[PDB]
């Protein structure tokens, strides 16, 4: 699997948030290239559509192909998912999620100029900019 | 199985319109015909992480009125995580009623209680469904229905969890006219209003109760906490949002006054004598609303 | 039952035959409920030292046997003598479950309760018999026996009332090898080791869990209170006495992880997924150990 | 600058702890390579000897070459520094360092099987294994 | 000659511009040339009915810098005030007092006789000493108090500090105000009407970046989390914090001020920048408070 | 003085030559008072962790040099960062004496106080330099020297910040033999013993005071906190680490008894009559050690 046209300062973010370097496969990375884009290449690993969708909030107009069979096996652009878990933090400090050993979860819906993220636990809605600011 | 058997009661958004009618009907039936031993050999945990004697007594009384056994605690103002605590308690008991100072705790309980259902007795600012079910069953008993009603809501509409849940719940019924009577700094939030617009539900704002008193079926008073504003603005504005018996001349005969309780200055005690006073009967109906909820969740076949 | 109307104060006071009776009754009450065995009985839940963890388990056991409960949980303050208190309460009720912040208090209750039995829910540092009984019933249920077992005890072995009681109780069974994994400042006391030597029981010391993980049937984690040393010395050495899921590769399939609770940092949450996690089932077994104990003391006939 | 023979699962660690991806230069990375080894390469950027020393605890047997002069200008292995700042966290929870806006600082000294790290503030010594666990 | 001799300092509304000019001038003079024994043999009462260590330390330091002796008290978080002041006014020569009830310093005035009363804040009502130090800081850093671009950010609805500062700056000429606050914590109407009735220019803005280019003073206030729900807080907080990256458009003369303490309002990377002046602001508190005490306790100040 | 405008944070930071300077100045200030050496100076007595014992001694030293004092003693609660606090206070005053419940806080103050010196009144477990300096001055005054002395240290040697600092400081002097008298669970730590071995300094362990009483010049009692073990283990072993007057038969005539204070059970009151009692005179010497320390940091010339 290979990811193309990653924005600037989103490659290392994707590697960190999605824990891509927590494997034993051959991984190759490139930052600030001609387009200032970023590129991630990882051998012999398949991402479902959800994991590609989970990249939409951080790298929206990007491409995800597969080249573990020495050829362009599959094409894929990231569409926006209905739920985003395990990477976002609830801006509501009183949310029970923080202290406890659960996974954060936010429901997604498109607005004009904005993306609303409703927490699964505290049932509070936030703009994605506020969730991603922290 | 009824549609609520062995399901958790966390949010009013999670309860469908079909579900709400079931709980209300079961409440009235349990009220009309007691079932004192419907939950014998059952042990329920009254887990009030945030202490609330008003709410705990109502819940635990409902528990006993169905012959259930009670264990619990009321903490004063936790090292062990809530997950660990509930993971333990879910091995002790058959149902968990819990009140928590952090939003989403009853939901987090669901993920660690296994097949022990978790009922929410309010999780901070988020949800308080039993109060809304208590409110609805009272409105239904006094108006005969939940549709085509004129409902006024007075007090702290910005921070009142009770009125947000109750407005949402009434929006699942048809032809309801809403009147929001609150000072500007405590107005009904936008997310409630658009929701009313998205279902084409009629709602209006009003500066005082005088405007709407003639054509209301429900007058719903909330507790205006003095801490939300400075004592100056409070004293300035409180006059437009209290209720005296003198304000009830034009009110309809069927109209009832409701209040989650406790009342401080909102409702003068001369209203208690009037036949529109129903806030105490409202609290009393809490027993049946929570009785119904417990029964529906802990038995499949309810001989109603 | 030879325990009828006798008090449950210390684990030294319980004979080996007695322990077998409680365990058997626990399993029987667990398999087939007896909801009304103690109907019309009134038990006093007297938590002089407040403990919600312990009280909920006890009172649930009481109610699971259809008994009514009265009690109290005093707030942290340190008037009426304990003797006077028990002399009064023993006129109200049929059994007294009590937790006290002073050692020997449940024993003192015995001398003023008459023939009203007194069950100890822990009197500070010495005894806590119900915790040991639930520990045993859990070990026995998961291992099929209490003899010839490899039992590791990790954490604060110097100040752990739970592990001293549990070691003594397991020392009344045969062929058990013990592994004590604790920092030197919180080592197992001398009087426990001498007790094991006087019965020719095998025991060994270990610096870490890695040494013993392969050949253990029971891993018993305790809460190392950060207060026992300065936060620095704790942080320096604690790493060898916490438990991560990655440490469970060589562990035996039948092996279970146990913990009195609550866990702070000792047990990482990745263990919960593994089938070795039994600290929650352990707490659940508390209900049956205490149901049995109450029944044996307030009834003669296994109904 | 180019770094060779980075230990396994330490390449992404170095990028994270030392904030190496916070630049506009061309960055190229590889993890789980032939030796597995790792490689970090960043164009037109030189780290001094002290900054190379700061990798000693994380990449002990590693090599640092240079490719800004179109040839391998210099070879260099990381020696152990006297102080390690801004990356380590004090295991002492009561340390003032945590709450406050200061820089963490530890003095370094070798032991036989151990490496002592004395905090600048609370003046308490820890094994490097204990400091790196948290 | 000195219209503030033996007069009380209760409200910023009570001080005329002529009075404010005198206090500022005396502050600057005392700063340049100390007067360590100007108030020798004087005894001042530091009466903090509502405890405030930040304010008490600054006040009492000012007292000692003029060679005065200090007596006082700081009550915990929970006899009529008239009796108290009637008694204390027989002990001391001046009363600096902070009280949790609005108008208390005024009530003290009516029972202190000829002992002057200085207000260290009466809850939501007034806090003149903070405003005077604010003014002296703005004046020192901008060279003037007229024709300035002054932005006020944060909790403008409940900030006693900013109401007094806006009121006080409205007695100077050509000041343009920029109020940057969420709608639920907007600047009150009676302050805006006050600005309109004197034809003073003011505008509202959603964020600090909107105005950063054309500001000489950026005045940050502490948005207390209790005034909104943590959810509404999190939604809106982003537009009212300040990071160093936001100071690219700032003018070279611009300074950042803050009453203190800062929680999340001002990121710590700003302290390095030359726009950080909130600590120097607090440092100026002594001179504003030295001046106020000196002017009040002497008829002839030969400076 | 080579210490002018330098902070007093750790005993490792003070060189041997520096210690000699403070001791000499203490003796000089003691013999001939200098009541106005720090006149017109304002020192901040910042006791974040309240300690009346320590504060009274410090503030008396401040006033004995004619300085004015402002400060606070916070109540037991665990907002504004310590960095922000010192950044503010360092604008008010000329020196900061501070006691803090978190280790390294006085060091953190140094990085935000600028050129305002910070004196440490103890930051929890690590350092407490003024206590060691008063201990030294007392030992030196009563023995005539700090070299070739027989010094016994009794009590809680594991958690005693006072004795670790005092041992390090005496290890900078020559030919001193140390006797450590403590129970095994509260023994002198390893890093102190290695420090003594690396300088070839003689040290020995002892179970009781009787072994060493004949050949000691200094007997240094510490407070064994009952909390460090359970009350039983304390009571069992404590008898070997208290001091009765009957134990002083063979003691040398020049020998003195020292104690940081407060004494609970460690020192029986019959010692007060003996001429070996010097723990109160020790506390009295605290005034002069801290007078000297303040003077050296705020003045160059021995007036
Ligand atoms: Zn949330
Ligand atoms: Zn530290």
From Swiss-Prot, chains A, D:
Its cofactor is Zn(2+). Binds 1 zinc ion per subunit. Pfam families: PyrI, PyrI_C. Keywords: Metal-binding, Pyrimidine biosynthesis, Zinc. Zn(2+) binds at residues 90, 95, 119, 122. InterPro entries: Asp_carbamoyltransf_reg_N, Asp_carbamoylTrfase_reg, Asp_carbamoyltrfase_reg_C, Asp_carbatrfase_reg_C_sf, Asp_carbatrfase_reg_N_sf. GO terms for molecular function: zinc ion binding. GO terms for cellular component: aspartate carbamoyltransferase complex; cytoplasm. GO terms for biological process: 'de novo' pyrimidine nucleobase biosynthetic process; pyrimidine nucleotide biosynthetic process. Involved in allosteric regulation of aspartate carbamoyltransferase. Belongs to the PyrI family. Heterododecamer (2C3:3R2) of six catalytic PyrB chains organized as two trimers (C3), and six regulatory PyrI chains organized as three dimers (R2). This is Aspartate carbamoyltransferase regulatory chain. The gene is pyrI.
From Swiss-Prot, chains C, F:
It catalyses: carbamoyl phosphate + L-aspartate = N-carbamoyl-L-aspartate + phosphate + H(+). InterPro entries: Asp/Orn_carbamoyltranf_P-bd (IPR006132), Asp/Orn_carbamoylTrfase (IPR006130), Asp/Orn_carbamoylTrfase_sf (IPR036901), Asp_carbamoyltransf (IPR002082), Asp_carbamoyltransf_Asp/Orn-bd (IPR006131). Pfam families: OTCace (PF00185), OTCace_N (PF02729). PROSITE patterns: CARBAMOYLTRANSFERASE. Disulfide bonds: none annotated. One of its GO terms (biological process) is protein homotrimerization. It comes from the Bacteria. L-aspartate binds at residues 161, 223. Pathway: Pyrimidine metabolism; UMP biosynthesis via de novo pathway; (S)-dihydroorotate from bicarbonate: step 2/3. Its EC number is 2.1.3.2. The keyword Transferase applies. GO terms for cellular component: aspartate carbamoyltransferase complex; cytoplasm; cytosol. Belongs to the aspartate/ornithine carbamoyltransferase superfamily. ATCase family. This is Aspartate carbamoyltransferase catalytic subunit. It comes from Escherichia coli (strain K12).
């Amino acid at each position: 699997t290979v990811i193309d046209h990653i924005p600037a300062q989103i490659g290392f973010k994707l590697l960190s948030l999605f824990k891509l370097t927590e494997t034993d496969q051959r991984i190759t990375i490139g930052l600030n290239l001609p387009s200032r884009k970023d590129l991630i290449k990882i051998e012999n690993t398949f991402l479902s559509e959800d994991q590609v969708d989970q990249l939409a909030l951080y790298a929206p107009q990007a491409t995800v192909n597969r080249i573990d069979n020495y050829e362009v096996v599959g094409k894929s652009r990231p569409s926006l998912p209905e739920r985003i878990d395990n990477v976002l933090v609830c801006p509501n400090s009183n949310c029970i999620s923080h202290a406890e050993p659960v996974s954060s979860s936010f429901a997604v819906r498109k607005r004009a100029n904005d993306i609303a993220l409703k927490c699964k636990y505290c049932e509070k809605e936030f703009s994605h900019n506020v969730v991603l600011a922290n | 199985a009824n549609p609520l058997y062995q399901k958790h009661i966390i949010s009013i958004n999670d309860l469908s319109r079909d579900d709400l009618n079931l709980v209300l009907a079961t409440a009235a039936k349990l009220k009309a015909n007691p079932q004192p031993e419907l939950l014998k050999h059952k042990v329920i945990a009254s887990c009030f992480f945030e202490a609330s004697t008003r709410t705990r007594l109502s819940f635990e009384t409902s528990m006993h009125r169905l012959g259930a056994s009670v264990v619990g605690f009321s903490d004063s103002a936790k090292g062990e995580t809530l997950a660990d605590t509930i993971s333990v308690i879910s091995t002790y008991v058959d149902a968990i009623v819990m009140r928590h100072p952090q939003e989403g705790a009853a939901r987090l309980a669901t993920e660690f209680s296994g097949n022990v259902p978790v009922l929410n007795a309010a999780d901070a600012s988020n949800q308080h469904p039993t109060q809304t079910l208590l409110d609805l069953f009272t409105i239904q008993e006094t108006q005969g229905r939940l549709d085509n009603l004129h409902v006024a809501m007075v007090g702290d509409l910005k921070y009142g969890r009770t009125v947000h849940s109750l407005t949402q719940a009434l929006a699942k019924f048809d032809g309801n006219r809403f009147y929001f009577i609150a000072p500007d700094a405590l107005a009904m939030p936008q997310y409630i209003l658009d929701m009313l617009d998205e279902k084409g539900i009629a709602w209006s704002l009003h500066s005082s109760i005088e405007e709407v008193m003639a054509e209301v079926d429900i007058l719903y008073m909330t507790r205006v906490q003095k801490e939300r504003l400075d004592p100056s603005e409070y004293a300035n504005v409180k006059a437009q949002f209290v209720l005296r018996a003198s304000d009830l001349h034009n009110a309809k005969a069927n109209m009832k006054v409701l209040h989650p309780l406790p009342r401080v200055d909102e409702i003068a005690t001369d209203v208690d004598k009037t036949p529109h006073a129903w806030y105490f009967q409202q609290a009393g109906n809490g027993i049946f609303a929570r009785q119904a909820l417990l029964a529906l969740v802990l038995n499949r076949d309810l001989v109603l």
